[PDB]
Amino acid sequence: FEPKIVGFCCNWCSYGGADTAGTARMQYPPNVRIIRVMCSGRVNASMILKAFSEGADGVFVGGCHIGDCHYDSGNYKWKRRARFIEDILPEFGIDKERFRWEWISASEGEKFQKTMQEFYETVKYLGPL
Amino acid sequence: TLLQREENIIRKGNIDKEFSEKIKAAGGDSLEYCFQCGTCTGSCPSGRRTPYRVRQIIRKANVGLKDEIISDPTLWMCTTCYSCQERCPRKVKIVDVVKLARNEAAKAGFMAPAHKAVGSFVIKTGHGVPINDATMELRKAVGLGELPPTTHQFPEALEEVQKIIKATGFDQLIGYNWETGEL
Amino acid sequence: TLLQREENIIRKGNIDKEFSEKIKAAGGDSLEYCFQCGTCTGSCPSGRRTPYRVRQIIRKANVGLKDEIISDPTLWMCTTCYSCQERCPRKV
Amino acid sequence: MEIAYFLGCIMNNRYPGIEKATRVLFDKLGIELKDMEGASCCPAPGVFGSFDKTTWAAIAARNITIAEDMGADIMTECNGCFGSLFETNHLLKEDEEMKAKINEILKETGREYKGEVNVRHFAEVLYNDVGLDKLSELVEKPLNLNVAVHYGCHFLKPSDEINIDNPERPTILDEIVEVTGAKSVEYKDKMMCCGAGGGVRSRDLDVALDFTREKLTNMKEAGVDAIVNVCPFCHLQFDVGQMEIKDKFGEEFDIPVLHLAQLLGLAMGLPKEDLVVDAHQVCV
Amino acid sequence: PKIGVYVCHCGVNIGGVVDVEAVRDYAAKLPNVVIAKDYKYYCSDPGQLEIQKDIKELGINRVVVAACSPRLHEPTFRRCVEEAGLNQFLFEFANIREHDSWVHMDNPEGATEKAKDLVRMAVAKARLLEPLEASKVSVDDKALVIGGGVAGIQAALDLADMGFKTYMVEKRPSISGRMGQLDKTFPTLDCSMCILAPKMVDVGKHDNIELITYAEVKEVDGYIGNFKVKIEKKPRYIDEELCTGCGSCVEVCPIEMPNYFDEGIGMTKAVYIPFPQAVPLCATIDKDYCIECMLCDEVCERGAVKHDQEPEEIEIEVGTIIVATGYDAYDPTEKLEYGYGRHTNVITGLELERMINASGPTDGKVLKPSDGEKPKRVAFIHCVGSRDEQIGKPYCSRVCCMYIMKNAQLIKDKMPDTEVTLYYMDIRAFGKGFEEFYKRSQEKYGIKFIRGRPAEVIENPDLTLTVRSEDTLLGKVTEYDYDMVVLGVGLVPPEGAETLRQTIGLSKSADGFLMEAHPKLRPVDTLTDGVYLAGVAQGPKDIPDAVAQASGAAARAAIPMVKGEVEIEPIIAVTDSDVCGGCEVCIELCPFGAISIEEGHANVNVALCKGCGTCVAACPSGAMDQQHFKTEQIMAQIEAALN
Amino acid sequence: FANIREHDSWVHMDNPEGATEKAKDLVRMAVAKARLLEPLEASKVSVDDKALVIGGGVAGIQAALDLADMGFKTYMVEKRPSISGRMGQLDKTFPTLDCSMCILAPKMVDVGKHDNIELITYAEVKEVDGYIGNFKVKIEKKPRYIDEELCTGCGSCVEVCPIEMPNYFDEGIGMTKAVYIPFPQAVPLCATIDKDYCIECMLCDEVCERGAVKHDQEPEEIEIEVGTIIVATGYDAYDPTEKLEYGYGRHTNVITGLELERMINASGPTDGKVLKPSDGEKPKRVAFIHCVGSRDEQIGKPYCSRVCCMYIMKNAQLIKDKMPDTEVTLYYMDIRAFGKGFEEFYKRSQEKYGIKFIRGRPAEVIENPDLTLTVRSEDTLLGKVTEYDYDMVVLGVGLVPPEGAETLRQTIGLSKSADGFLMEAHPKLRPVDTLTDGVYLAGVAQGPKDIPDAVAQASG
Ligand SMILES: Cc1cc2nc3c(=O)[nH]c(=O)nc-3n(C[C@H](O)[C@H](O)[C@H](O)COP(=O)(O)OP(=O)(O)OC[C@H]3O[C@@H](n4cnc5c(N)ncnc54)[C@H](O)[C@@H]3O)c2cc1C
Ligand SMILES: Cc1cc2nc3c(=O)[nH]c(=O)nc-3n(C[C@H](O)[C@H](O)[C@H](O)COP(=O)(O)OP(=O)(O)OC[C@H]3O[C@@H](n4cnc5c(N)ncnc54)[C@H](O)[C@@H]3O)c2cc1C
Ligand code: SF4
Ligand code: SF4
Ligand code: SF4
Ligand code: SF4
Ligand code: SF4
Ligand code: SF4
Ligand code: SF4
Ligand code: SF4
Ligand code: SF4
Ligand code: SF4
Ligand code: SF4
Ligand code: SF4
Ligand code: SF4
Ligand code: FES
């Protein structure tokens, strides 16, 4: 079983963190697919639900650390949305461990690598949705 | 003659990289990033009155001069006062390295008889400083019990201590012979 | 005992500045600007087989440890081969 | 309040006066001292920690389990015992593999280390749990004494782990001492080791005695009347080593050595026989 | 849509792991794609020429590039497509190097599949892109320089000589910074004031410079070319226009207070002039010490004393900002083993600089604080407050070695009989003439160097000081006596640095100093457009390095002001009035207040919107949509990632 | 002007009365001269708004781009066929370990595309005449024997060429053809024929489709008029052949730091593999020697080269990352980690990579029969002589002025400092100006320094 994982990362920190992991050449499983947004505040539950409905076995969202958002308040709104999404997902048979959201700074390549590896292990263990 | 062809040069034959790896793996890895400022030696009170130089011990541990360290008498001049460790600008755990080197030296047979005597006292009575008759009389006179509520008073506690010592092999380390109760 | 309260510390009682001034005035003034790279000791053939350390001799001469130098047997281990002097980066 | 009472070796086997003074002082403070039945050497870190870390940690862990059985924190008034027990406690708590190894060793003794209690120092308990005000209230005989305070190395260091006071220039013991009316006198190299630690006293007595002789010279130059310590190991070093220094070099200091508990008992009007001054080699 | 796909080998960075042949064919076979090519280096000139030729010939209206991260080369390809006539924002970037090839080296097949999926997602997004015209905004041809030290003075003079009107805000009553406090400079031992004072006078006389001393920057708003700055001028209680700096008020004042210029070892009056070469040469009253005796009022002939002065608020509009706020000297009081603040005859390097200065408090005489007599023995300790993890200062301060050697040389010249010893770990004489200066310290002046970090400084009863330290090259502990000990304190960010950093909105580096945009190639730029760094504001360094940085910052700030225009990215929210219901759950979500309500419909202000997309994600009905990040585009990308 | 401070007051301190009499006499002389002075109107001369930048390294590229972005038409003369300087030869940079080419190549392309920059590579400045605002410069463009306007840099000519010659870019450890492109990111991306090696076989002519090969090309003379000049000519690496005790050029497995930079580069001659020159296998033990060609009065080099410590530590870290099992030892006198993040980099060299530091200037390097190398050196912190064996020894060579520096200095008319680099107008406050008006210095032309310092100087 090879899980299908979709990722959303803000342009300024989390996408920067993935770039840092790449430049340092920190290996991690190739299942994730990153989609760029300007801010984690651009992400809403419709995208997560669409991902899970289209065949995703896990959804990752990455943002700036609280207090570090380029647009200064977007990740707060995302954090609220993410808590609500964790509320909603188990009602349709989707474990909330299949939906991970983390704060990754632009220089935190190693944290991004570890998050990717661990999320892949979790989703693979859970098995197909 | 001042000639001595072995003591005045360092080659690979004097180096044991396994010793350094063992020390670093056992909790002395910080010795890797000592930059030899000499603050520790300046802070050392035993270095002022003995040939003990803690900075050179750290350097030898990094280089891998096992035989030079474990056989060195000055290795036993450290009082573990922690003065060096409080001031190290690189935050090296100097006392940890000293104790690990002493452990390696003890494993190699460089144990003083007095330390072995302390160990034998702990084995026999559970106390590094066991009570004597005069102190028993003093204890009785002042309202305390003749014996403290320790392994002195509870043989089963002493048996547990001896079981621990046997399990850890400490008796074999100091050459304690249970049959005769001697070293 | 390893105790010895005099041999393991340097105070002003161990220093003779007149000795250093005399050495520098007699043709050894260059010792003033040794920066202790240790090239001389590495080049020294007697330092490989005796406790003789020429760099420490230069350092003691600069500091003024007369009694430590003149009474030292290793001072007589130098063959005057000039290997150190050919390579000193400070031209001591 | 209740706390397990660890005794060590030197206090209960050479200087019972410290123990009696401590018991009386804690009874006057409404703190119940519970004996740790079957306790042994902590073991003294200087020799055992230098010889085999595993044996030292195992013996210390058994001592800690004795107190864990009673569900009480350990209180020590020896810097050496405090250092040994505290280091073992925070090593086993923060290291799962070492905890597993030590528990494997402890199994055959019918004990298991849980990491459920805390190791505390006598002076720290006095300063935090009692406070300077309550200690002052209990003073009935304000002392007139110039005392040299010897902190000992293992009360405060390594400070990164102990985090009690600043090791370079601490004040906790000075404040406790001054609550009794005595005056803590500054002297050269105050934070210097007494020389007895690390197993040096039993390995090279001359080196340890020079440590002590340097300290005593500095204290004498300050004109102190007594030495105050919170370590029976340091207490023994000073007391016995003054006699040893006299016999070896014929140098007389005649500076009485007191434990902090003994000084508190003196300031609290304890019976003279309770201090057991006859245990001391240097006449007080 | 005619999509042209360009897959970059990047040499072997992508090609080595990802098969740029299979990916190219996959792209060629995807819907709406009319061409697929691969080139070794697309960002290079030949690759851009290939892209432009393809656009001109095949009439491509969408360009997709499978290359490195967009954060690196998105502007490059945007301008490339622009120069070929295509719109800037019809362009798409697929990240197959940092996100695929460099992180899945051990799975080449999985890497190629991921690259195929990523290119599919990129083409899915590019299908729905549309042109967007970017708006130009004028760049104000004015600059602000914060800090009046050597770096700030240099930056202001360079900008003013290039024709730009410059404001220079300085928190002290006078400009000069720390260079005015130095007696001589290394490695030449030339007088610092003799060469700095002409520049200070130049700044004070320049027609293009507005000098505002004794003032702080309180608020900064806006963006490049369009900065609104609120400055607070503190009350001197002296009229700058009237005061001539004669100093009679100082002569008559009865109160004595520390002089900040003398670094705690010099005294002045409650009304004071910081030093004779001050610019502006004006008096200042510190009301913490004034008793309001009006003696200065009575003795002043110009009528310049104003005890009822109030703080003034100035608002300026500038196009660029240069931060040149310098540093403070480390306070070694926390190093208890060295006894600063406890031992009488322990001083710092900057205090020694003031003491050796002929215009300093002691008239240029190095005297013991304890008795006012010359020391016969002096020790210097290197790396105090630096290279020390015990205090969280793991960096080198970069100048303490040299100024320690310089002050030792100065003490030797003034008092040849003095003995001077330096306690060092490394001698960092790296600059031009620095190694020769280091050798001259020994050969000419006879300064003694001990390689050892001192363990302790002990004050003896007679107030002399014993340095206890190992001589590591002798391998032995030494306890040497000295009449004076000088701590070689390091450099730390100035007091109030965090307040100004937050006011402007800049980041800081691990050492606590301000962070440059790129460590190697943009040393004076920041990531905030229109804001530049000069001098020790960016980190410890010596005067020539700070001056070079100030000139570079002036040039970099001049470039956009010469251009006179900048482009605003059009990635902004747009409201569909026919769909918007005026619910207004979007207005509060904009941190910049870009959304208002007109005619019952949400309306976005382009000047205020920054393009975060928060409001768009919040809008349930979808009336709000972000340009270049539309919901349909992200939904198509999600669909393509899994299908 | 009467000079009574430098000529009277500061030189006769012990004779105040004689000093006052001398001051009176000097003021009398000044007034005597001032009596006969008359007004003179000074003539203004126009300043050409054009700049010349000599040298196409990072400093020169930065200076040219800054001038061109400010609106001035700039000429950039570069003696090599391509711009980049020494930064293009580096693999990574300290203290971040980022790729140098990845960040330099966009700037090179920018220089190549700028409307305000005229790039003249493979050219030298032959004559400079005139003064500020009014400089007449004669430049000699050497014949490439390839048409720059036609060549596309495809490289087929290189593929077919039969002759092999050293590649200057690879610093003596890499080979190319008689027709060559210095590196793939060259700007201009153009071929060059070295006639010292060409046999005129016309294979390149036949394989070229653009008709860019011109075997009858001649040197060209260009005359430009500029208002300002910026010298950014960089440096050369020290040649340690004269240090006979270290055996460079004699021992097989002794290399320099720059050669190691080329070897560790993925685009270098060895495809990024650190291999012994003797057998082409990875070394298991590597020694680095600091201060080679620097801080040494035996060779007349009493200055610090200022970057060798850091790039030594950087290349040690790179060798460790590529080959974690390798043992690396550095022989140093001082570790000069003075820059921003440099001390942290120094600590990371030990904590993370386990690089060994020996404080000792090596006395000798001895080649053993099996071609391994014994470094004989005192460990001064152990106070004992050591003889340690290594598979490779890397000399931390310093920086020296480039070849032909004196010719250009005389052509412009500039002075030089004691170290041999060009002298600035004032050491403290005019670091980038010279005493010749209208001529400026940027980068290592003024003395050794790292990339950010050179870039700041170029902008200034
Ligand atoms: C003891 C000592 C000796 C030295 N000797 C030498 C030497 O011999 N040669 C040498 O080359 N270098 C020397 N240096 C280093 C040299 O002083 C610095 O390189 C130089 O001072 C840096 O100039 P700067 O303009 O960046 O900073 P500074 O000189 O610190 O000037 C910064 C200015 O900004 C002002 N400021 C700060 N915060 C604000 C704010 N919020 N708003 C407005 N203004 C503000 C300050 O008041 C100050 O006027 C020495 C340093 C020390 C400590
Ligand atoms: C092995 C090594 C590793 C290094 N690593 C780093 C590092 O990791 N990080 C770092 O920051 N710095 C590093 N440096 C230092 C860095 O290379 C320099 O700071 C930088 O190259 C200086 O740039 P420049 O433009 O001043 O000179 P250069 O890079 O030398 O460029 C000068 C240019 O001028 C040209 N030129 C010369 N003479 C003439 C002439 N007469 N006419 C026309 N053109 C001419 C040259 O061909 C060259 O293109 C390293 C240096 C070495 C030797
Ligand atoms: S103080 Fe620390 S860094 Fe300095 S020599 Fe000792 S262990 Fe090494
Ligand atoms: S702990 Fe040991 S090495 Fe460190 S200062 Fe104390 S006696 Fe010296
Ligand atoms: S070689 Fe010269 S500079 Fe180096 S230690 Fe010997 S005498 Fe001093
Ligand atoms: S002359 Fe020869 S023997 Fe004497 S110190 Fe120099 S190298 Fe050694
Ligand atoms: S476009 Fe990106 S991936 Fe392609 S060569 Fe340029 S930097 Fe490398
Ligand atoms: S306030 Fe008046 S008296 Fe004082 S300095 Fe200014 S002009 Fe002179
Ligand atoms: S009014 Fe204030 S400043 Fe003026 S003389 Fe009186 S105390 Fe001094
Ligand atoms: S420049 Fe010298 S004194 Fe200053 S921090 Fe660096 S090594 Fe220490
Ligand atoms: S949230 Fe949507 S519907 Fe409501 S006001 Fe904003 S744009 Fe209109
Ligand atoms: S996209 Fe962000 S900045 Fe723009 S209007 Fe919406 S919330 Fe405000
Ligand atoms: S000369 Fe012709 S074949 Fe050679 S690189 Fe140039 S265009 Fe290609
Ligand atoms: S003509 Fe010269 S350059 Fe061309 S292929 Fe022949 S040898 Fe090579
Ligand atoms: S930077 Fe380091 S290696 Fe280079 S010359 Fe200076 S001290 Fe020697
Ligand atoms: S920009 Fe990354 S969370 Fe707002």
Residue numbers in the entry:
A (entry chain F): 3 to 131
B (entry chain C): 2 to 184
C (entry chain C): 2 to 93
D (entry chain B): 1 to 284
E (entry chain A): 12 to 654
F (entry chain A): 104 to 563
What is the paper's account of this structure, in its own sentences?
In the methanogenic pathway from CO2 and H2 studied under laboratory conditions, low-potential electrons for CO2 reduction are generated by a flavin-based electron-bifurcation reaction catalysed by heterodisulfide reductase (Hdr) complexed with the associated [NiFe]-hydrogenase (Mvh). Here we report that under nickel-limiting conditions, in Methanothermobacter marburgensis, F420-dependent electron-donating proteins (Elp) are produced and form a complex with Hdr. The Elp–Hdr complex uses F420H2 for the Hdr reaction, fully substituting Mvh as an electron donor module for FBEB at lower nickel concentrations (<50 nM), at which Mvh production is not detected. The Elp–Hdr complex forms a supercomplex with Fmd or Fwd to perform electron-bifurcating CO2 reduction using F420H2 as an electron donor.
To further characterize the Elp–Hdr complex, we performed cryo-EM analysis of the 1-MDa fraction. We obtained structures of the ElpABC–HdrABC complex at resolutions reaching 2.2 Å. The complex is a dimer, (ElpABC–HdrABC), of heterohexamers. The architecture of the electron-donor arm, containing ElpABC, is similar to that observed for homologous subunits of the FdhAB–MvhD within the Fdh–Hdr–Fmd supercomplex. As predicted from the sequence, ElpA is a truncated form of FdhA and does not bind a molybdopterin cofactor. In ElpB, a hydride is transferred from F420H2 to FAD, and electrons are then transferred from the FAD down a chain of iron–sulfur clusters, eventually reaching the bifurcating FAD in HdrA. ElpC has an identical role to its homologue MvhD in structures of Mvh–Hdr and Fdh–Hdr–Fmd complexes. Cofactors including the electron-bifurcating FAD of HdrA and the CoM-S-S-CoB-reducing non-cubane [4Fe–4S] clusters of HdrB show conserved architecture and coordination. These conserved structural features strongly indicate that Elp subunits functionally replace Mvh subunits under Ni2+ limitation by providing electrons from F420H2 for the FBEB reaction that drives reduction of both CO2 and CoM-S-S-CoB.
